[PDB]
């Protein structure tokens, strides 16, 4: 009943940094060639959405943020072959065009069509599908999931199991897959190893889940908020440390705890200082450190390259290294077969209209993931 | 006969920074338990020895430098089982104790007994075997090869083929193995890949040799001294670029030349700026950059961690990642079996007494390796 028509719906528009979202009517254009219009069902609040608000992650404003979500296809543009109306789908904030040198590479996942490295806040064709108060509104990472309806490029959507519980599997669209893949795929955590995870939010807990799945013997959670420790232990941390409790810097503490440095460390916060601390705490000759946290816009870290010369490996990744369109449906299938759990990440559920309360919960330290239902 | 006796011999003593070496008589104590006294046959001039002179690499002075060498065992202390008098040997500036967590790790080589991290300039027992004009003289990296005789710990020496040409295989003690292993073992260069090698001295040329052995399709040499280009092409560079020839930063040039970034880059100079440039020029999603150059003492680089978050891998290594005592004999056997060439690295052969002339050749840009012969 809406195919080929403009849809008026509610979205959460961010007009200005450091302000609440405005829940108000937008116009959503119909999908053009190779585009998909999705009726959203559930979306998570990821710290990267907050980074848009805080100016940590710069993207053009005004904007419809949201990137961790699931929904149902309402209509498809001309030439779409990979989804149909009524399919359950997860928007892919990292696209998989299948054609660029990264998509063709066996390891690569950061498709060259992404809108993260130099955000423009458009569709692939450089235009917007959103109008609000007669004004064009930017997209976010090609997804814009804080809206009852969004339009995405076909390379930014994956079809998932028709029997999927969308209020759970939305987390496969960012935080779970990112953390789990950062452990199992990017770091390649080994059986019997010692891991250190800096930051025990939704992504860091997913890193712990991956470290445990990989058979780590020790998984040391690190957070300045000790309220995060109980859940971290529930999902596999063997011990938790708060840097504020120690006179010495936590890299020294972790090196001593691990009898000379950890096998694998993960920065899952987004601070320059913890990226360097996380590198330093891995064993100097054979340790691996993975950066997951999003750094503050345009800021450089300072480090001593002797940390690398001794033999450390330092890497980072987007979306856990997963090729997004290949991987998302398989992760959903694995979830359905109980290969991993998502409930430990979900601490709060709210209607979409209470999005601002959801962001308050994140900023206060109370929540891990709040799931918003449309 | 000399066994059990102090030897008086000639050595090149460095009394203070930024002065010529002093060629004079030293006293070399006999080996204690688990020590080996070696009559030197040939030693190469590595830029790392010059770093001791320039104060780039801090180690206690006064010192007998030299770490890239080969010689013949003169005597063994109590308890030595791995070499005997008369054996050809290569001193190992990275030891292999076989007992520490690094030596036991499949991918570690930076043995915790090394004297590089926190240089003491002694034997393992904390004492020196050298005196000169009634003063104790420091060791360097447990080797001290700028002397007609040295004493090393057993964990810092490897027995090699009795038919080895020591005036060639001394380069397996540092520069060849470092560069070759940085390509084949640390980076794991792949067939058909594009590599960029920053710095075309003895170590960078050895990196090119390894990239070619690994089947790289393109190997781009980068040096500010265009006199280095002919030999780089002889050993496998497909093209060479001088950053001074370009208006753009060379990372932009290399990204354009490689249609979006190289597969593997190597920093083989020792500059903070080239370490960051070499990281930046590797493909942002799947590129690998290896730091080989020794950085200036206590100086930090500045970089944007988004270079890593997109998917790059950054690592460094000492001695090409090779477990030294296992690997050096095999590299010598491989050389004897014609698996690689050393002559391309050797531009000058001088008597030991001409050490300062050998350093002046390196500093002027006019040599790759000078081999000093005793
Ligand atoms: N690489 C990717 O693809 C990707 C994906 C998803 C999230 N992210 C980023 O990953 C980070 C974590 O996201 P999230 O889990 O949703 O965030 P979160 O829920 O805010 O968790 C961050 C945790 O870090 C803790 N913390 C803050 N400061 C410190 C400190 N100094 N030391 C130790 N702990 C500290 C904090 O208490 C919190 O529990 C954010 O920067 C995101 O932007 C990146
Ligand atoms: N990691 C290890 O185990 C290890 C082993 C051996 C050597 N090293 C280091 O590796 C580096 C190279 O050693 P080497 O090959 O004996 O030295 P080298 O022979 O002096 O070669 C260095 C090359 O870098 C070139 N160069 C200098 N500045 C620049 C610049 N700005 N841009 C591009 N090219 C430049 C220079 O012209 C020369 O050809 C030194 O820092 C050594 O200390 C490390
Ligand atoms: Zn692509
Ligand atoms: Zn996210
Ligand atoms: Zn060891
Ligand atoms: Zn050297």
Distance of CA A48 to the CA centre of its chain: 7
Please say whether the beta carbons of A18 and A66 come within 8 A: no
Sign of the four-CA dihedral A196, A201, A203, A206 = positive
Q: For A275, which of B275, B294, B305 is closest by C-beta distance?
A: B305
| Dist CA A44 CA A369 (whole Å) | 6
Element (H, E) at A39: strand A35-44
Task: Locate A91 and state its tokens.
Answer: 């928007």
Task: Locate B308 and state its tokens.
Answer: 């890593």
Experimental method: X-ray
Please say whether the beta carbons of A148 and A22 come within 8 A: no
Q: Which of A110, A309, A322 to probe by mutation at the B interface, max B CB count within 10 Å? A: A309
User: A199 a known binding residue?
Assistant: yes
DSSP B343: G
Query: What 3-state DSSP class applies to B328?
Result: helix
Q: A134: burial class by Cβ within 10 Å (0-12, 13-18, 19+)? A: exposed
Which residues 266-285 in chain B show a CB within 8 A of chain A? 272, 275, 283-285
Q: Which of A316, A318, A321, A324 to probe by mutation at the B interface, max B CB count within 10 Å? A: A316
| Dist CA A219 CA A242 (whole Å) | 14
- DSSP sequence for A218-266: EEEEE-S-GGGHHHHHHTT-SEEE-GGG-SS-HHHHHHHHTTS-BSEEE
Resolution of the structure in the document, Å:
1.1
How many angstroms separate the alpha carbon of residue B267 from the centre of ligand 2?
A: 8
> In sequence order, what are the residues at sequence separation of 6 or more whose Cβ sits closer than 8 angstroms to the Cβ of residue B159?
B82, B83, B87, B88, B89, B329
Taking residue B273's Cβ as centre, other Cβ atoms within 10 Å add up to 12
Hey, which CATH number is domain A176-320, 3.40.50.720, 3.40.50.10070, 3.40.50.1220, 3.40.50.280?
3.40.50.720
> In sequence order, what are the residues at sequence separation of 6 or more whose Cβ sits closer than 8 angstroms to the Cβ of residue B290?
B182, B186, B187, B264, B265, B266, B267, B315, B316, B317
Q: What are phi and psi of A212, to 5 degrees?
A: -65, -45
User: Kind of pairing, strands A69-76 and B194-198?
Assistant: unpaired
Q: A215: burial class by Cβ within 10 Å (0-12, 13-18, 19+)? A: exposed
Residue found by looking up tokens 């309806």 in the block: A149
Strands (E), chain B: 7-13, 22-28, 35-44, 69-76, 88-91, 130-132, 135-137, 149-153, 157-159, 194-198, 218-222, 239-241, 264-267, 288-291, 301-303, 313-316, 346-351, 369-373
| Dist CA B75 CA B64 (whole Å) | 20
Please say whether the beta carbons of B302 and B278 come within 8 A: no
The torsion defined by the Cα of A142, A326, B307 and B191, in degrees rounded to 10, comes to -140
SS3 content of chain B, % helix, strand, coil (to 5): 30, 25, 45
Contacts of range A350-357, beta carbons closer than 8 Å, 24 or more positions apart: A352/A10, A352/A12, A352/A23, A352/A40, A352/A43, A352/A146, A352/A148, A353/A10, A353/A23, A355/A12, A355/A21, A355/A23, A355/A45, A355/A146, A356/A20, A356/A21
Check whether the bond before A226 is cis (ω within 30° of 0): no
Element (H, E) at A271: none
- DSSP sequence for B297-311: TTPPEEE-THHHHTT
Check whether the bond before B62 is cis (ω within 30° of 0): yes
Element (H, E) at A196: strand A194-198
> In sequence order, what are the residues at sequence separation of 6 or more whose Cβ sits closer than 8 angstroms to the Cβ of residue B16?
B61, B62
Sign of the four-CA dihedral A241, A244, A247, A250 = positive
Strands (E), B140-236: 149-153, 157-159, 194-198, 218-222
Please say whether the beta carbons of A121 and A14 come within 8 A: no
Breaks (C-N over 2.5 A) in chain A follow: none
| Dist CA A309 CA A306 (whole Å) | 5
Element (H, E) at A315: strand A313-316
Task: Locate B371 and state its tokens.
Answer: 């081999």
Residue closest to A372 by CA, chosen among A363, A364, A358: A358
| Dist CA B301 CA A305 (whole Å) | 7
Check if A54 is active-site.
no
* Radius of gyration of chain A measured on its C-alpha atoms: 20
Taking residue B84's Cβ as centre, other Cβ atoms within 10 Å add up to 12
Q: Is B238 on the interface with A (CB under 8 A)?
A: no
Taking residue A127's Cβ as centre, other Cβ atoms within 10 Å add up to 11
Query: What 3-state DSSP class applies to A337?
Result: coil
Between the alpha carbon of residue B149 and those of residues A96, A372, B21, B171, the distances in Å are 62, 75, 17, 18
* Radius of gyration of chain B measured on its C-alpha atoms: 20
Query: What 3-state DSSP class applies to B58?
Result: coil
**3-class SS string, B99-134:** CCHHHHCCCCCCCCCCCCCCCCCCCCCCCCCEEECC
Q: How many CA atoms lie within 13 A of B78 on its CB side?
A: 2
Chain B residues within an 8 Å CB radius of A306: 117, 295
Check if B51 is active-site.
yes
Residue closest to B340 by CA, chosen among B176, B216, B203: B176
| Dist CA A169 CA A41 (whole Å) | 11
């Amino acid at each position: 009943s809406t195919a080929g028509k403009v849809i008026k719906c509610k979205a959460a528009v961010l007009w200005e940094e450091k302000k609440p979202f405005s829940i108000e009517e937008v116009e959503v254009a119909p999908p053009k060639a190779h585009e998909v219009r999705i009726k959203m069902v559930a979306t998570g609040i990821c710290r990267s959405d907050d980074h848009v608000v805080s100016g940590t992650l710069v993207t053009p404003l005004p904007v419809i943020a949201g990137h961790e979500a699931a929904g149902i296809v309402e209509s498809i543009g001309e030439g779409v072959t990979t989804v149909r109306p009524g399919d359950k789908v997860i928007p892919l904030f990292t696209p998989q065009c299948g054609k660029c040198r990264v998509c063709k590479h066996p390891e690569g996942n950061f498709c060259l069509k992404n809108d993260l490295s130099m955000p423009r806040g458009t569709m692939q064709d450089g235009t917007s599908r959103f109008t609000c108060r007669g004004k064009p509104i930017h997209h976010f990472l090609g997804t814009s999931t804080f809206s009852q309806y969004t339009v995405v490029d076909e390379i930014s959507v994956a079809k998932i199991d028709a029997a999927s519980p969308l209020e759970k599997v939305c987390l496969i669209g960012c935080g779970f897959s990112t953390g789990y893949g950062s452990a199992v795929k990017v770091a390649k955590v080994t059986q019997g190893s010692t891991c250190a995870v800096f930051g025990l939010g939704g992504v860091g807990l997913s890193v712990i889940m991956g470290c445990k799945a990989a058979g780590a013997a020790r998984i040391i959670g690190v957070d300045i908020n000790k309220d995060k420790f109980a859940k971290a232990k529930e999902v596999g941390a063997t011990e938790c440390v708060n840097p504020q409790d120690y006179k010495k810097p936590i890299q020294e503490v972790l090196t001593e705890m691990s009898n000379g440095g950890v096998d694998f460390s993960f920065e899952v916060i987004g601070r320059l200082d913890t990226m360097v601390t996380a590198l330093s705490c891995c064993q100097e000759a054979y340790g691996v450190s993975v950066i997951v946290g999003v750094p503050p816009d345009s800021q450089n870290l300072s480090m001593n390259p002797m940390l690398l010369l001794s033999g450390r490996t330092w890497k980072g990744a987007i979306f856990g290294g997963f090729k997004s369109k290949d991987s998302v449906p398989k992760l959903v299938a694995d979830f359905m077969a109980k290969k991993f759990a998502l409930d430990p990440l979900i601490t709060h559920v709210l209607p979409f209209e209470k999005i601002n309360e959801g962001f308050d919960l994140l900023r206060s330290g109370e929540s891990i993931r709040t799931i918003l239902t449309f």
